[PDB]
PDB file of C-alpha atoms in Angstrom:
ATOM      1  CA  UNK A   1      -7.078 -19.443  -7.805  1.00 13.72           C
ATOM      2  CA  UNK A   2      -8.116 -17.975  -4.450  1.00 16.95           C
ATOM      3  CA  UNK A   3      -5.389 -20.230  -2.221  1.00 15.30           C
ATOM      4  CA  UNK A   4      -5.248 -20.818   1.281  1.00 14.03           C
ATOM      5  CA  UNK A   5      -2.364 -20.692   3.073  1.00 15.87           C
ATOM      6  CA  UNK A   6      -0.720 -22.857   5.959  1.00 14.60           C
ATOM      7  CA  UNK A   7       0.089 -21.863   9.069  1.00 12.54           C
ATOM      8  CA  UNK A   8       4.142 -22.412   8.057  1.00 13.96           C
ATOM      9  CA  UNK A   9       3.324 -20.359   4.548  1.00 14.49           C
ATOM     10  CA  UNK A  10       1.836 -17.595   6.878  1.00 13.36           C
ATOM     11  CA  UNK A  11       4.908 -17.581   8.814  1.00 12.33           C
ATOM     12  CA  UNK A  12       6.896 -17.141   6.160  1.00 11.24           C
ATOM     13  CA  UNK A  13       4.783 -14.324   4.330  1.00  8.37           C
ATOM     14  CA  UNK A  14       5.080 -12.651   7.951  1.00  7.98           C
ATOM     15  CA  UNK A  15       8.889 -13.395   7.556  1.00  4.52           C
ATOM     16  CA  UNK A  16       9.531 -11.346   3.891  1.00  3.25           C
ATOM     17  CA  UNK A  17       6.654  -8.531   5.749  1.00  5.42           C
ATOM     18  CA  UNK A  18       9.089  -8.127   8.446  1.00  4.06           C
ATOM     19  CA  UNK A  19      12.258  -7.288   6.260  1.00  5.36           C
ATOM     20  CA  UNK A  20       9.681  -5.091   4.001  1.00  2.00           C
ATOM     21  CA  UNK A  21       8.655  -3.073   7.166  1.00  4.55           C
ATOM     22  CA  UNK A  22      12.436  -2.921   8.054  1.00  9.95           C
ATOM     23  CA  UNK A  23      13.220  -0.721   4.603  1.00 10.13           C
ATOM     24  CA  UNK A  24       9.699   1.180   5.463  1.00  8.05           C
ATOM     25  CA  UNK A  25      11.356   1.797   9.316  1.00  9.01           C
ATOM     26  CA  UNK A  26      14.701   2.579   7.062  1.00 11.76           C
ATOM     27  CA  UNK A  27      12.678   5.241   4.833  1.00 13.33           C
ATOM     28  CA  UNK A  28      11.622   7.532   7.646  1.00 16.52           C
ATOM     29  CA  UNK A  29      15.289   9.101   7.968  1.00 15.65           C
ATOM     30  CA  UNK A  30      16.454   8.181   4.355  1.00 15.76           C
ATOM     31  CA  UNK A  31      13.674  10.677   2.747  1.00 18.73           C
ATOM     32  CA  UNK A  32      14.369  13.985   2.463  1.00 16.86           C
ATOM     33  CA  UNK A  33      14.452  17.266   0.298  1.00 17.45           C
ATOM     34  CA  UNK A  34      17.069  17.230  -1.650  1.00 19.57           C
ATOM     35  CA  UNK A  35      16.958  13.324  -2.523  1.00 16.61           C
ATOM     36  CA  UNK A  36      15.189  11.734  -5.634  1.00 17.44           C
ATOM     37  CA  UNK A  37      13.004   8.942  -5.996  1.00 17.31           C
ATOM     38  CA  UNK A  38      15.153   7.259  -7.610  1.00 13.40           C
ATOM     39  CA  UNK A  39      17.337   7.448  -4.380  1.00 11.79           C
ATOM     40  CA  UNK A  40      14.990   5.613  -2.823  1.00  9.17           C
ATOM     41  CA  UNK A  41      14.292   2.869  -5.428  1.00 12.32           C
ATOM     42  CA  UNK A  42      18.674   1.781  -5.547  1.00 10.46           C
ATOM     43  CA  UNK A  43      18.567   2.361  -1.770  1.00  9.29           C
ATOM     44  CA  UNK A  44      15.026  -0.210  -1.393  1.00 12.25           C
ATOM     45  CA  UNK A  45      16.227  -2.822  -4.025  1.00 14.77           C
ATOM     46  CA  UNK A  46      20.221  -2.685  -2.466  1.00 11.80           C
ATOM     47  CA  UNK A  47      18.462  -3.373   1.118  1.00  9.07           C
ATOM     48  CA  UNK A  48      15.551  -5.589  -0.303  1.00  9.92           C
ATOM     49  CA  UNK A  49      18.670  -7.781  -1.983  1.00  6.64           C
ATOM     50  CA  UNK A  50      21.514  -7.325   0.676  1.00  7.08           C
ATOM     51  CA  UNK A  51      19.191  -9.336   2.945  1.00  7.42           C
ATOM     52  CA  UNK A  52      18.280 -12.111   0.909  1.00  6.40           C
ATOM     53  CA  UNK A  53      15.226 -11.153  -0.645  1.00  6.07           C
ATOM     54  CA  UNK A  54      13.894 -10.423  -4.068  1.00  4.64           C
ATOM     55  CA  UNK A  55      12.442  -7.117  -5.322  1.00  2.08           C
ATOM     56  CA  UNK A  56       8.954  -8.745  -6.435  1.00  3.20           C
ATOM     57  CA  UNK A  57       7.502  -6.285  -8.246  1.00  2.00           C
ATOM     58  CA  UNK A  58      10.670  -5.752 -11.023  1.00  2.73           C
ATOM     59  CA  UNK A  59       9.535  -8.327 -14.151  1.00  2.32           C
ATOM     60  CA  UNK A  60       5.803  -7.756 -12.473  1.00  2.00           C
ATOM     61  CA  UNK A  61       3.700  -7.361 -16.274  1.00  2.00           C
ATOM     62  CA  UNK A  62       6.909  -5.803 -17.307  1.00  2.00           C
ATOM     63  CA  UNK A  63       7.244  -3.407 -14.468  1.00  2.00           C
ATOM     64  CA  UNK A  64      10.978  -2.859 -14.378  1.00  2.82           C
ATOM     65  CA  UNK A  65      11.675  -1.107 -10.551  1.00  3.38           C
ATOM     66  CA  UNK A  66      11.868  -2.440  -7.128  1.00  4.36           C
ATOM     67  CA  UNK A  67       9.363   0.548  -5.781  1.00  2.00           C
ATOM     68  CA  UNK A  68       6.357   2.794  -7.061  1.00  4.18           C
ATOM     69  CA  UNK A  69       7.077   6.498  -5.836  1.00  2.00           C
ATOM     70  CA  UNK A  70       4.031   8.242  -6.646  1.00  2.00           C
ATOM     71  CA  UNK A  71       4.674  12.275  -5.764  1.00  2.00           C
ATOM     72  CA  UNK A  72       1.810  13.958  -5.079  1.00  2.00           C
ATOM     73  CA  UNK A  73      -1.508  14.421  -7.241  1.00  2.51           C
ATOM     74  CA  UNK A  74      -0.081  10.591  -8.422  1.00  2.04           C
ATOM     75  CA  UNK A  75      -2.192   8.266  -7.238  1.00  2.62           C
ATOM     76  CA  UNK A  76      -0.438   5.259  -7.636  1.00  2.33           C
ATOM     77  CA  UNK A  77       2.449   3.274 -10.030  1.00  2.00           C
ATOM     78  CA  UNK A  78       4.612   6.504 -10.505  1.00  2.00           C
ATOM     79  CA  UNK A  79       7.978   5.007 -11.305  1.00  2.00           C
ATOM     80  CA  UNK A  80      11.130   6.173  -9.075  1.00  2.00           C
ATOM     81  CA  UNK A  81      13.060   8.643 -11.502  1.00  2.00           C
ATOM     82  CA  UNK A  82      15.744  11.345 -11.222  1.00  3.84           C
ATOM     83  CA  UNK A  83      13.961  14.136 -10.230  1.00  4.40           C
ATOM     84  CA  UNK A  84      14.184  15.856  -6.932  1.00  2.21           C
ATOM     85  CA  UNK A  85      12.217  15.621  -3.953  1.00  4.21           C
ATOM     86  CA  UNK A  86      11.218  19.046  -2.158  1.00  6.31           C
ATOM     87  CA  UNK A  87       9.614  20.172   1.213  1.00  5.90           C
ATOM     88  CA  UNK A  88       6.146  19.489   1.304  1.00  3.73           C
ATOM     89  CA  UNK A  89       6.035  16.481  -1.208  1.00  4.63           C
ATOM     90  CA  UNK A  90       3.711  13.650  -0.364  1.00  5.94           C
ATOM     91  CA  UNK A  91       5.308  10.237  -1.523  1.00  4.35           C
ATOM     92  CA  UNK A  92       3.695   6.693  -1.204  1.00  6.94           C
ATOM     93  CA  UNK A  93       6.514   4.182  -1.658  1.00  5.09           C
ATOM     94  CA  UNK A  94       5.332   0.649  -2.528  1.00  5.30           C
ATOM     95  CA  UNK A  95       7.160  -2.321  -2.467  1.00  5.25           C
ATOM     96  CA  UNK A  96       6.509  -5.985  -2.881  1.00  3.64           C
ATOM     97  CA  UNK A  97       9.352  -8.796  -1.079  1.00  2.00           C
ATOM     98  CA  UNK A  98      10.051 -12.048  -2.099  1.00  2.00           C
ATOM     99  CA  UNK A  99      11.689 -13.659   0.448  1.00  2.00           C
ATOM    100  CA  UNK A 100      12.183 -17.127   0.010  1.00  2.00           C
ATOM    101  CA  UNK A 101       9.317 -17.570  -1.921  1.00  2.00           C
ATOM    102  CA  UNK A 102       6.845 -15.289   0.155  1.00  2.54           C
ATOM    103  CA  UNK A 103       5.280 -12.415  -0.888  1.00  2.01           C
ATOM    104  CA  UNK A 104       4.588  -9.265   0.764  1.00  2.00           C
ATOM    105  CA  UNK A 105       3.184  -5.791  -0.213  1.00  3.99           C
ATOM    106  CA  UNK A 106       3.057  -2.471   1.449  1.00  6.25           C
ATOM    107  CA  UNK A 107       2.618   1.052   1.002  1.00  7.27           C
ATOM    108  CA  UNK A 108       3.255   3.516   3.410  1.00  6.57           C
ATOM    109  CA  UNK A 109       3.227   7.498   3.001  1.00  5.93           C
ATOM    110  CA  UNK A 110       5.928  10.051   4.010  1.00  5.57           C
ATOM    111  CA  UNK A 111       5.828  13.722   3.570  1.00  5.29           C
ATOM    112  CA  UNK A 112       9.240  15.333   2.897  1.00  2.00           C
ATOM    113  CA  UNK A 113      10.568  17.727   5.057  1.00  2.00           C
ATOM    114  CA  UNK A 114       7.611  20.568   6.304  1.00  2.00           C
ATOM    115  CA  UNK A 115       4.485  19.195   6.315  1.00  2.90           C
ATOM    116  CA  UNK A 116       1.434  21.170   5.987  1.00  4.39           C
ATOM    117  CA  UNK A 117      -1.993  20.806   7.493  1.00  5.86           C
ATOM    118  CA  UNK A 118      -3.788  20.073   4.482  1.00  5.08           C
ATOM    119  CA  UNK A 119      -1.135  17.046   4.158  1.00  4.41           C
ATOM    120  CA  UNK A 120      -1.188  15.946   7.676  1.00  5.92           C
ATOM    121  CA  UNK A 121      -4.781  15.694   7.655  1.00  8.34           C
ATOM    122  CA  UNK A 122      -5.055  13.988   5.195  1.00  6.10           C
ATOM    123  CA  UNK A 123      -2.290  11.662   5.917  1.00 10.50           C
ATOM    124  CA  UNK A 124      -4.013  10.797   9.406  1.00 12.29           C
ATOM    125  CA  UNK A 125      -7.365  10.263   7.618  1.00 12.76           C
ATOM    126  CA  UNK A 126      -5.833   7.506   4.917  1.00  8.99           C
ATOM    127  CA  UNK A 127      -3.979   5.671   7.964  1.00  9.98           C
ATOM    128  CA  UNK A 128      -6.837   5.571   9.927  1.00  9.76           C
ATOM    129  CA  UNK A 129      -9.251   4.326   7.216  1.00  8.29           C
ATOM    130  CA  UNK A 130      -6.664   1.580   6.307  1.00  9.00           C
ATOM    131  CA  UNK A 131      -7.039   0.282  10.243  1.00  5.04           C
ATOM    132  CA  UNK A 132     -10.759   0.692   9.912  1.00  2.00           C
ATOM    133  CA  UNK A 133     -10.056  -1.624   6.877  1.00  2.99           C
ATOM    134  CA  UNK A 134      -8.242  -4.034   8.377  1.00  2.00           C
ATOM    135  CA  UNK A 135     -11.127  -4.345  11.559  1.00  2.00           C
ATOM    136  CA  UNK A 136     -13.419  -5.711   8.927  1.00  2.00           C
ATOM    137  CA  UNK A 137     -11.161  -8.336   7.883  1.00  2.00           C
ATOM    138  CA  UNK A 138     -12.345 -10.975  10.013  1.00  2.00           C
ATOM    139  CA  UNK A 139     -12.858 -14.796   9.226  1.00  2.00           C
ATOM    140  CA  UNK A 140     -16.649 -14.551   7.925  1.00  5.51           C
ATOM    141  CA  UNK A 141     -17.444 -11.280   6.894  1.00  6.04           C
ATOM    142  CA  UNK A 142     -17.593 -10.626   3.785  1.00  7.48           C
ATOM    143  CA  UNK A 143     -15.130  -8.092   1.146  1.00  5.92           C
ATOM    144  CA  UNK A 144     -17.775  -5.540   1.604  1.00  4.43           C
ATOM    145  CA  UNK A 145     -17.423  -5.018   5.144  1.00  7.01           C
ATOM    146  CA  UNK A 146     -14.065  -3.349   4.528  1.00  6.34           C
ATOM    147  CA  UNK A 147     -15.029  -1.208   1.516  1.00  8.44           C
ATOM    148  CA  UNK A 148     -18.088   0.139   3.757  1.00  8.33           C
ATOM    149  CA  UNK A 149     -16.060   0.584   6.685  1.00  6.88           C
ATOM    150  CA  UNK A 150     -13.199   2.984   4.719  1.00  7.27           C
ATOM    151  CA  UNK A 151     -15.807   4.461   2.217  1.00  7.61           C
ATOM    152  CA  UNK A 152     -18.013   5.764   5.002  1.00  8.09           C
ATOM    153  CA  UNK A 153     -15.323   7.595   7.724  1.00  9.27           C
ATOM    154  CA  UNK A 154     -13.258   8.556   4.229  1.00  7.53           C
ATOM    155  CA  UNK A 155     -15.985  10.669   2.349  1.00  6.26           C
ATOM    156  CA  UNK A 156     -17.083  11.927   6.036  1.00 10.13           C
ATOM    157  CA  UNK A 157     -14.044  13.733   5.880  1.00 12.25           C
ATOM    158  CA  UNK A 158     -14.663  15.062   2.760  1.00 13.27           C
ATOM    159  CA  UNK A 159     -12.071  13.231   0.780  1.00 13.25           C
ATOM    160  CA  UNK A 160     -12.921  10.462  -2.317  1.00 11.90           C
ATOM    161  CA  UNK A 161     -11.967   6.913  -2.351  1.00 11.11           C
ATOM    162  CA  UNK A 162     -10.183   5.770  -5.326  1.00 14.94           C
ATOM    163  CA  UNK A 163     -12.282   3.292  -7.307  1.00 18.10           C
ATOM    164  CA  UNK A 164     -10.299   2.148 -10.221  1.00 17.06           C
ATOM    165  CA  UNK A 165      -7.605   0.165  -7.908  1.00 15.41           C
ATOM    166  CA  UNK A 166      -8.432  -2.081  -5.540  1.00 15.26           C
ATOM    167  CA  UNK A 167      -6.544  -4.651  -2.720  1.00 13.46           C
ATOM    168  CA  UNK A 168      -6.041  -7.925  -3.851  1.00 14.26           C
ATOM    169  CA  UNK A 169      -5.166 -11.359  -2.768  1.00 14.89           C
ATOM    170  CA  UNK A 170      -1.196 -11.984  -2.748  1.00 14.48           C
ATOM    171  CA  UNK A 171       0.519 -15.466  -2.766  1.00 11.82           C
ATOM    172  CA  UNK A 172       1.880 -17.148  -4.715  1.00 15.26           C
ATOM    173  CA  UNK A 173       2.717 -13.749  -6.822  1.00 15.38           C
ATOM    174  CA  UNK A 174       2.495 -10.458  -5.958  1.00 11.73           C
ATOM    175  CA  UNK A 175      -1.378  -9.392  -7.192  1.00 11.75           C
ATOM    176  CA  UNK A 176      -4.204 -12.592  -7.073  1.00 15.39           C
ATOM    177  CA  UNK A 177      -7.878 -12.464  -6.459  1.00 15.66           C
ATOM    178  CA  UNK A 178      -9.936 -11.773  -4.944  1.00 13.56           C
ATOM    179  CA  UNK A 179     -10.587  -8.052  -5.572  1.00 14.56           C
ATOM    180  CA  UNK A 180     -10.796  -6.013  -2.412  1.00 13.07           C
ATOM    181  CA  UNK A 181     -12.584  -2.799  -3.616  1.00 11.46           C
ATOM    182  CA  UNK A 182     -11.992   0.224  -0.764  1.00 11.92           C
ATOM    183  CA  UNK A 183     -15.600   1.505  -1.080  1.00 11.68           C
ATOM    184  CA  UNK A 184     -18.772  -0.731  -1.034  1.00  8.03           C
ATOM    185  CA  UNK A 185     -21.654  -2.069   1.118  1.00  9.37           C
ATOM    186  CA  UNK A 186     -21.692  -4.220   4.469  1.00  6.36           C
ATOM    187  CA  UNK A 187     -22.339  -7.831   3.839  1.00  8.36           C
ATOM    188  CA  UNK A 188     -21.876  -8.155   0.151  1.00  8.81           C
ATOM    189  CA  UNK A 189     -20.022  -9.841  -1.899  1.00  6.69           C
ATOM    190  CA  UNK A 190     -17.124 -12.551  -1.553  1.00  5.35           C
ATOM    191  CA  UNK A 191     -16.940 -14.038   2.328  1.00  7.50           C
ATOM    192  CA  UNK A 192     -13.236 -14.054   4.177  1.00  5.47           C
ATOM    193  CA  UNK A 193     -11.888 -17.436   5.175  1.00  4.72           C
ATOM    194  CA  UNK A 194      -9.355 -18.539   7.213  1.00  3.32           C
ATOM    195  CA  UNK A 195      -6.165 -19.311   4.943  1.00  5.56           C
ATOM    196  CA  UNK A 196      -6.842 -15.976   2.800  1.00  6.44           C
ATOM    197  CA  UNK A 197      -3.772 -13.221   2.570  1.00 10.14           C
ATOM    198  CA  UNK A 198      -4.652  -9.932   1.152  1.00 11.38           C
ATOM    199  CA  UNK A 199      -4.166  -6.514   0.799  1.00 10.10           C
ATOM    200  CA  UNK A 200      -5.626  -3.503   1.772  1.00  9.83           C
ATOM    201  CA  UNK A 201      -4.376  -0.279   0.611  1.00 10.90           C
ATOM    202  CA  UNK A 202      -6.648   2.942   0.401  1.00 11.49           C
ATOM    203  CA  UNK A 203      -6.079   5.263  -2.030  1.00  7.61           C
ATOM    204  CA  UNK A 204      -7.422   8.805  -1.154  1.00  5.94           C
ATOM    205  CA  UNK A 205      -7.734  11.901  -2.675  1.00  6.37           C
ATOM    206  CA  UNK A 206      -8.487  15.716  -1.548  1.00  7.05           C
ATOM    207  CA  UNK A 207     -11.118  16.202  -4.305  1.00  5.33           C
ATOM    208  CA  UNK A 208     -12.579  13.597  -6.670  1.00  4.70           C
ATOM    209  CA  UNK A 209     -11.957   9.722  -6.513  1.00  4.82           C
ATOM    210  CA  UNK A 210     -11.912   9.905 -10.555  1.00  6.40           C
ATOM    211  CA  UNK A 211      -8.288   9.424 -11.816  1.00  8.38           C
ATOM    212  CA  UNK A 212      -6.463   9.869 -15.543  1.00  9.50           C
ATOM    213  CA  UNK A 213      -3.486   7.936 -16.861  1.00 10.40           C
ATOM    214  CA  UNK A 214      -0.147   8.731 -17.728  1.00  8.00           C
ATOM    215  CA  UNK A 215       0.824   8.206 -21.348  1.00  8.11           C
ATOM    216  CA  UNK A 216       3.379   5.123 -19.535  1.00  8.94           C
ATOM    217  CA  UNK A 217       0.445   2.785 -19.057  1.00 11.50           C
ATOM    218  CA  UNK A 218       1.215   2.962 -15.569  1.00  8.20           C
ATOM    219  CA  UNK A 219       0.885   6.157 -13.705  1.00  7.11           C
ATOM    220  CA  UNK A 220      -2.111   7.364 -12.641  1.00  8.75           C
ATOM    221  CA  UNK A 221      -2.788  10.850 -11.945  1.00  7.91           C
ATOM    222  CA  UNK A 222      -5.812  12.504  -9.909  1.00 10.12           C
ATOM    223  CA  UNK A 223      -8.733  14.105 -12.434  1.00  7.21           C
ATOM    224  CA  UNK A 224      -8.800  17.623 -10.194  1.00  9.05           C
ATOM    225  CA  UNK A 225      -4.928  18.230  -9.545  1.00 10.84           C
ATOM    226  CA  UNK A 226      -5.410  17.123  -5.941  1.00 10.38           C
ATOM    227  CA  UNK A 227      -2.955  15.319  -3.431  1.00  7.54           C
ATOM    228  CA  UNK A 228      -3.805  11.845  -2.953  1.00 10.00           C
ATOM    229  CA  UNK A 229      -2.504   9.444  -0.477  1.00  9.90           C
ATOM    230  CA  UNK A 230      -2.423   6.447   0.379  1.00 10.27           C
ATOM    231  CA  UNK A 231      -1.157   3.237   3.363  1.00 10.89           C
ATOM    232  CA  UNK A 232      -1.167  -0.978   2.805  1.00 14.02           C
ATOM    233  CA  UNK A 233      -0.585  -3.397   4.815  1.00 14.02           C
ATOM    234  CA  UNK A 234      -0.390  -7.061   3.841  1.00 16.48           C
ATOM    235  CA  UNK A 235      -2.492  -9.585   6.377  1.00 17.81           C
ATOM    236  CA  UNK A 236      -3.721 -12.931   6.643  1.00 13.54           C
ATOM    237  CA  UNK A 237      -7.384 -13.648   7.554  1.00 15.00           C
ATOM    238  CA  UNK A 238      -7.299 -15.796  11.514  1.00 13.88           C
ATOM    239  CA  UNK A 239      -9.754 -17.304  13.630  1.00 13.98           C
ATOM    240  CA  UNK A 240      -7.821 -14.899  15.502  1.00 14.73           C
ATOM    241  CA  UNK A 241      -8.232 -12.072  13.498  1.00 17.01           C
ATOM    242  CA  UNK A 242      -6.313 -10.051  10.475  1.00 18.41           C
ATOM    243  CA  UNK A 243      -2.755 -10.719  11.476  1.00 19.77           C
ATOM    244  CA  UNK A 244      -0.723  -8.151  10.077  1.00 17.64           C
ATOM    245  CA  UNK A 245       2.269  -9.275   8.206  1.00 20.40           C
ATOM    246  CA  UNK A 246       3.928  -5.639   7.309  1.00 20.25           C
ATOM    247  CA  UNK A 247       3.360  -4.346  10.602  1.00 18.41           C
ATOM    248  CA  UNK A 248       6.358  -1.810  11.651  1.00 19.11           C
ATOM    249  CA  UNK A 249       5.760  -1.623  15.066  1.00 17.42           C
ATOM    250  CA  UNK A 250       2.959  -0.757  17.251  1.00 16.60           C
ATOM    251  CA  UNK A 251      -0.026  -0.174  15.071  1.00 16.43           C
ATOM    252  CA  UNK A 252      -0.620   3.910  14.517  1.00 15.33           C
ATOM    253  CA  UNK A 253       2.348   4.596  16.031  1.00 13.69           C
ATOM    254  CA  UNK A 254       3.732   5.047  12.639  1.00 13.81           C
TER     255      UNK A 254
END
């Protein structure tokens, strides 16, 4: 149930992470005010599909979209819908590929048209805890080295960590174990090996890490009202080191 993968299964999970970082590189001009998520789902799924690949997350425990567009105080699983997107809305748009059988997942953030500083900072923060992350994810330490390293510079900022979604293992579907919580304590619990592919994807919020649900199932919604953020990237655990599979380019240059 945990699998190891092959070095010609990691190849091809870096393979479906490059054409998911593609529609990610695609995104930064294609959002805007004036748009609606829903936009960006047909535009995702037609560039997801038009390539070869297969929207993994539609049929997903009944999930029925290509994307999650979560606007705002959402914290994650906000469904793409016909409603428009204004200045100063913080989206995270996740998306899962299937590409010839291999999985991929990421995340990334965009903030639509004027930013502001309470936004940018928090923006930077998230990114930079997701890197911190992804340090930790080395072949023997353990799944608590990367919720201590993003707990610790995250609530030294003065923002919460979400705790009721966590990273996960990914292949041959788009969510396996193990768990890989975002907050925790160096050295404990479940120990990296070579072979593993996981995510990690940081959810963080202005105010408290507690979080309600939407009515949907699906949705869920910070406790306070504030704007919560979040970045994933999709890697597999080397003797060499996390290799990032959903990379977009040179790493915190976007």
């Amino acid at each position: 149930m945990i699998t190891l993968k092959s070095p010609r299964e990691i190849e091809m999970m870096d393979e479906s992470g490059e054409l998911l970082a593609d529609v990610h590189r695609h995104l930064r001009t294609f959002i805007k005010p004036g748009i609606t998520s829903w936009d960006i789902e047909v535009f995702v799924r037609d560039f997801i599909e038009s390539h070869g690949g297969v929207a993994a997350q539609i049929g997903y425990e009944g999930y029925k979209y290509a994307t999650c567009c979560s606007i705002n105080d959402e914290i994650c699983h906000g469904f793409p819908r016909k409603k428009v997107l204004k200045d100063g809305d913080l989206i995270k748009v996740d998306m899962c590929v299937d590409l010839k059988g291999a999985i991929s997942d990421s995340c990334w953030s965009y903030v639509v048209g004027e930013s502001t500083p309470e936004i940018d900072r928090l923006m930077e923060v998230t990114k930079k805890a997701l890197y911190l992350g992804i340090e930790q994810a080395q072949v023997g330490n353990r799944i608590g080295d990367i919720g201590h390293a993003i707990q610790t510079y995250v609530e030294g900022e003065g923002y919460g960590v979400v705790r009721d979604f966590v990273g996960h293992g990914i292949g041959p579907t788009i969510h396996e174990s193990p768990m890989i919580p975002h907050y925790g304590e160096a050295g404990k619990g479940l120990r990296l090996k070579e072979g593993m592919v996981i995510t990690i994807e940081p959810m963080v919020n202005t105010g408290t890490w507690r979080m309600k649900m939407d009515p949907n199932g699906w949705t869920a919604y910070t406790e306070d009202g504030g704007l919560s953020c979040q970045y994933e990237h999709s890697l597999a655990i080397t003797k060499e080191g996390p290799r990032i599979l959903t990379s977009q380019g040179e790493e915190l240059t976007y």
